[model samples]
Target chain A: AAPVLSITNASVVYPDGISTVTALDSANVEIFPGELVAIVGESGSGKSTLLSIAGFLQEPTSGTVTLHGAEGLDATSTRREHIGFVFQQPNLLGSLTAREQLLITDHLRGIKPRKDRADELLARVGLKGLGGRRVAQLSGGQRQRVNIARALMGNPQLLLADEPTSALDARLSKEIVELLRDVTKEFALATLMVTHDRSQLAYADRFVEMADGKALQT
Target chain B: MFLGIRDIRAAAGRFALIASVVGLITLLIVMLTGLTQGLGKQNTSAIEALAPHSVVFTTAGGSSPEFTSSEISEQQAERWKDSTPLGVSQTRIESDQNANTTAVMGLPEGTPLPDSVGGFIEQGALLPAELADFLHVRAGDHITLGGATVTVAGTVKTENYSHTPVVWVDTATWQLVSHTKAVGTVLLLNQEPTIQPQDNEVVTDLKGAFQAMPAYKSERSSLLSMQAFLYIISALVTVAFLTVWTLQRTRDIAVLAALGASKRYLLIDALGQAAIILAAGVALGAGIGALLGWLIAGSVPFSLGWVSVLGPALGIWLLGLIGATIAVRNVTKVDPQIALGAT
Candidate 1:
């Protein structure tokens, strides 16, 4: 499979009043479509910053981030078409139903939101009849399922997830990681997920260990 | 609007509260506008009802165009021979046992009468409907003005000056009582005057003559000041409420942005929410105000017209939107990186 996302010599240095700190240091990585890559790092090891840069939430202080073979694109608009994010928390809007959470992304993409497609994805994320439920009414695991369904709703080429199961138990973590892996292969998405749970690495196609603000091996 | 509509539905109570607040403000503004217009009519209805293209007056040494102070010479009045002469003065009248203060107006032949009156009175006095009702008189009755008993020719509607009922009399009789040999207080030109005035004379339109009415400036200024304050408060309240509303949704905004939503989309959603609330509030307030005005029409001097009621509603909606726009600009500041756990 060809690479859907490529990052080269990306560095993020935060200037903190005479004392500088490097959050990310010249990190290089690539992820191919149909690949589920797990990023393992301790707290404050720059994994979250790396995820942010990869997801186009922040700009690299130096070097480049390319998505779907295009470089230096405006991340805000590009992210809408080419990228999706799953946070540690479900982060679903309380005002929206489970299906509406997915439709909102379709609205951002300027497409007519399809109820059948929302239902199909809801089923794909294992939330079959629960699509009509709101975020407040859903259980924690079910809300995360809707969150994953919302991320997939845009049909993005690159999926960047930050500790999607950080709030779940061990059993649910593996189950969610397995769901992410299956969805990655099924949809041919380039999935890069950061997680502190090392036991969940079996679901990933490859592993990237990060320490001291840099990937161990490019 | 997707998020806006959904949020309002989810938090119906909160949105309803905001809408009610705006509606009440709109109601106050509309009612006040009607009352101001009504009171203003009492001050200058007679002059406003006159069909004059322009008017010329002798300058009262920097005072407004006062009927009491302006003294046009007979030469000046004869110069505008094509123009109509009208005399105006505030005085008291006696109808049987009833004594009431009234404005005496001298109208020459062929002058226009108010809609409620039949025509110009030749030898008798014509009273406005308000004064006729006040003095309990009708046609063929007599009222004494300046010690002369004149027949009540007819009754007209909404023709009053300086909050006093008007009585139309002959020019010679008006000259006898007001003691002006200049024919009238001011000359009412049918169209724009071609003849120029000499020194100490000023020419103006009917709109300018309105300033000449006594208590017109101070009365209008005080009411207008209150209106301006209401508008400012409406804006400030909208801004304050929406600022807190948007701030409370910062996390929600960050989450949406992280899920591939643009700043423009979020802005449109938030502003659309504000517009819906403002529109509902303005509509509700205007409806209640119109109902209240209708109910008190007989008891209160409230001018109930479409422009008087709906104009302030539109202004309130627009001003409230501006305030909301200022308040919700914080939507752009929500960092999606916060959603990624990157601080």
Candidate 2:
């Protein structure tokens, strides 16, 4: 089947006073279901920025990023319901609990949270019994896992994760990446994970490295 | 449902502060509302109970048409009657000449007197309640004024005008007091209110009559100035407090926005907080006012009733609410993006 998401000649820049920052210049990448893509780069190589653009959280300075299997940009409010995004840190809403994180995504999409779907997603995220624990009560790893569960709450066909294991210990980092790998294969999801650690590249279906603003095939 | 409950719990003190202010304001307003009405009633009860809407007079410039000054002659009476006016003459009578006490009023001859106060006081017998209290002399009262040996006429009720206790007398008896043929009388207008004052006297209804009262003008002026100041201070203080409160919550508001909570929800929450504060403040103030009113009523010329207490209390509540509304309107401008940690 065709790629789930494709970026061609995509470039993003940030303003620096009167000048600009060329974050990604003519960057190109593609991902398909059952294919886990790992993007590696140095500290300021703009890997996270690229992922943000791909997830539609940021607009590129000048480039086109066409994400297939997702409704068009101008589609109805129902369109964004299926696009999953996991941020660098666990950006869980402080007021919500682990289960509530998944519950609200459906609520924002004008769907009720207790239609048996949110509960099932909570179980999938390994939070079968922790429905009422607020964000402040959960540990760092637990919160990030909840974030991942929040992304899947929309039942998206594609998953875009930004620096999922950037701040974890070696064992925890390995475990988290392994978890992502198993999840992508099980769901047959087209996954794009942005990272700066090359040692963690072994679990990826396909891997690429970047220098300056250009992706180099590995 | 979102941050509404959490924000309250996370920052209980701030919410409590607002609620207390609102509560206090409510207390003050309710008490003030009651007190205003009560004071107004106390000040105007005598005049408010008058039979007619307004009075007409024969003079253009005078303090009032009391027995001491105004003297309507027979011709004046004829003019008033032809104009369909209701006229009643007035006079001052010494109830007990030896006691140095007196009463003043003028009613037409043979105006039927109440049985208890009927001719008994007139015949140098028992004194009526008003005359006994005012004249400070008992029954068998004797009075000498303008060379007439007079007895205490019967008192119908305690009546006063311009703070002077009045006693009723027939036109014939009043003729002896003024030592003049002229009959000084009061008038009631049967038609619409007048455009301007009539010559030699004042023309006004109950509220306007206060201006002509001997003690009203100065007292009203001073009290009104203080009341006005309180209103201004209440509004200003409330506004200042609310502004700071809204600013302090700016960060919290941003977070709420990021959570997909609408500005409407936050705005309502803020106002609800203010409402609680005003209610507390007003209630406290009103409680104090009521206590003061109760302590000083009647003995100190203070009238304590529901209106006097409620009126000022209502003012405090309304003004506080208005102040809080202005303060909380800022909630709509809070950026949810800030709450989202986007910055």
Candidate 3:
């Protein structure tokens, strides 16, 4: 099967005082559908820079990033239609209920939200019967579940999660990692998750380690 | 609007507090507008009744024409054909029940009268209904003016000058009451005069004539200044409230932007929130103001009309929307990358 996202010789450089630092250098990565790839490294290991370039949050200085075999796509529209992001923080709007968090995605796309679909996704994320609750009403793990459900609202092919379990307890983090692994196959998504924790590697289909702006797959 | 409505619902207390402030400001502005119009009518309704006609006054030392300082001679009146001589003087009218000061307006023979006055009286004086009601006098009743006993022909519609009710009389009666041999105080010209005026004469339109009344000029200026300040203050208050509100929502905006909410969508949402607030507050204020004006109409010179109520309401709403637009524009500048944090 063809890969869902492709990065070729991507490099991101930042200009320090009278010097230049390479945040990401000559990196190539491919993510295929039904696979979850975990990127692990210490702080300042170019993992975030690579994820940002791959997610269209930042541009590669001298290389190309492609989605569905097409280059130079409109970043905003692609993010709206074909890409979904889960932030390190839950980042949920306090005013919205759990269901409205999903419906807002459709609203941004200028379409009527299918409420039944939202409820089904909430059920899939183990948040059934909790659609009416707001952010304050939900516990931390439930909030993260709502966050995952919100990202799936757009039916994206590529899912990018930035430290999805950074704030959870050990058991809750293990459960979240397991949930992400199951969703990658069930939703047929190309999942790229960046994490600082090493124990969660058992759930990933593959793993990439980075050091000094270089990414190596093992 | 979808997000905006939910936001307001979530923060109902804050939104309601700001809306009430806007409502109070609107009330003050509308009330001031009504009072200004009411007082202006009380000061110049008699002169304003003679619309589309210019008034000729004898200028004093090249200054603006004033009713108290103007006196036109018969020769000066003759200089303009098709002109009517008007005599204006302040005096007291006495009835068996009461006595009050009035403006005695002398309408000479063949002078035109407003339709509201019913008709000109050939013998005796005509009292405005307000003054007649105050003194409890009717037609054929005798009243004392300037120590001369005069019979009341009938009552006419209410008209006033300098906050005093008017009493219409013939030229002879006016001369007896004012004790003046001059033809009249001023001459009314139906059309613009073709002839040049003497150095002492000043010709002005109806509005200029009203401004020439010092009491009317000073009262209107003070009230209008207050009204203007209230409008500006309402706008500034809206700006301050909305600016803080937008700043508080910076993180939420960045999240939405990162989620692919269009710039246009976010802008419309913010403006829709402002519209809802302004509509609610301004409508409440205008309704209450009109009701209050009606309640006090009998006791105070407060007129209620579209110009006084709806005009100010629209001004507050539009100006407030402008301020909100300025405050919420910061949403556009928020970087979506901020949602990703240090990465």
Candidate 4:
């Protein structure tokens, strides 16, 4: 099967002082569904930049990257359905119920999300019946679970998690990685989890370290 | 349906506070409209009653509608008699029994008096409703006119002149009472004089008639000023309320924005909030305005009706909404990215 995401010769620059900062220079990567890919990096590693280009969240300065769309997902209405993003901190809408936060993904995609599916996804993440709670009222781990649930609302084939458990303690961090691993297998989704934690590295089907903007395959 | 009902339920006190502020402003605007129209009617009722397109008088008569100072002779009336000049005059009548001064108006034949004998008496004298209220007088109650006592033949809801309630009597009776040439302060006529009232008045139109009233311009100017202030208060109140609301709700607005909800959507939502509060407030204010005008209708020199009451209600809502729109504009531009704390 074709890879879910492919990026080749991607480069990005930021305007900084007299000299521009080359954040990503000629980066390349490929990811496939059912793969748990880990992007390990220290601070300022441009790891997030690599994942951003793959996810279409941001465009590269010069590159050709394609996220293979599910047969029914290429329509403009479903463009938001193909990829899901999980941020470092839980950015849940406080006014929305936990389920509403997930349904918002379907809303953004211009689809009428199934409420039962939303509830089931939350239940799958051990957050059943937590839809009424606001984001502020949830603990870090529960919020992370909701964030994952939110990502799954569109039945997204590709999950781009940007250090989604950085704010959680070790136990919660381990649980989150385990959850991601289980979700990738159970849902058959391709997940690219970017992080600097070595403890969570073993769960990935494939792992790569980043230094300077280049990926070192492991 | 109000989709914000659940939000309002969740935050009852906030909506209540906003609704209360909106209601108060609504009340103010309604009352202002009523007072403005009331004072305006008081200022212009006599002139409006002349219903003549034009009126003319000697320069010295001033704005007082008194026949004593107006003093146009029969020759002046004769100069414009064939030209459709409607003669009008005012005389102060001290009742033989009460000794209180009441104004009696001398109207030329066919002055369009309100009572029209009301299908009642054959030779009835029509009294304004206000005149009946002030002197404890009623139809068939004899009262003195000028220096002579005459029977109060009937009652008419006639517009007052010079802030005084009026009594309309045939010019022949006016002559018997005031005992002068009995020409009024001005002659209301349809014909415009190619020449201004050179010998007597060839009064052309309502504007020209105002030149005869000693204070036509000043009185109208005062009334117009009150109306302008009334509208200004409406705009200012809405602006102030929305400004406070914007400051308080910015956080909530920012949160809405971060959810991939566009700025335009949030703007629409905010405006909807203002509209709900404003519509209810304006409707309530209008009710209060009509009730207020009704209560004072008896004592105050005012005209109470839809023209007087509804105009105020509409003006308040229009100006208030505009003010609120300006204040709520910031709702769209907030950086939800920062609000998300991801930046």
Model 2, TM vs. native: 0.67
Name the candidate, 1 or 4, with the larger lDDT value: 1
The sequence of per-residue lDDT tens digits that candidate 4 reaches over residues B4-30 is 323454566766765666666656655
Residue ranges of candidate 2 with Cα displaced over 4 Å = A1-39, A51-58, A64-85, A89-122, A152-160, A164-167, A178-192, A203-218, B57-78, B82-186, B193-202, B213-343
For all candidates, the clash counts are: 0, 70, 0, 7
Decide which is better by DockQ, 1 or 2.
1
Order the candidate numbers by DockQ, best to worst: 1, 3, 4, 2
**lDDT tens digits by residue: candidate 4, A15-78:** 7798887677788787888999999988788787786666654468787777666443322222
lDDT (10s digit) by residue, model 1, range A1-218: 56888889899988868998899999999999999998998988989888888988888999888887556567788888888788888888889999999998898788999888999999999989887887768987888888889888888898888888877898887789889999999998899999898998998999899998899984
| Of 3 and 4, the candidate ranking higher by DockQ | 3
True contacts kept of 3: 0.52
Position B246, candidate 3: lDDT: 86
Q: What is the lDDT of residue B270 in candidate 4?
A: 73
Error of 3 at A122 (Å): 0.7
Winning model by lDDT: 3
Candidate 1 TM-score for chain A: 0.96
Docking class of 1: medium
Residue A204, candidate 4: C-alpha displacement in angstroms:
2.2
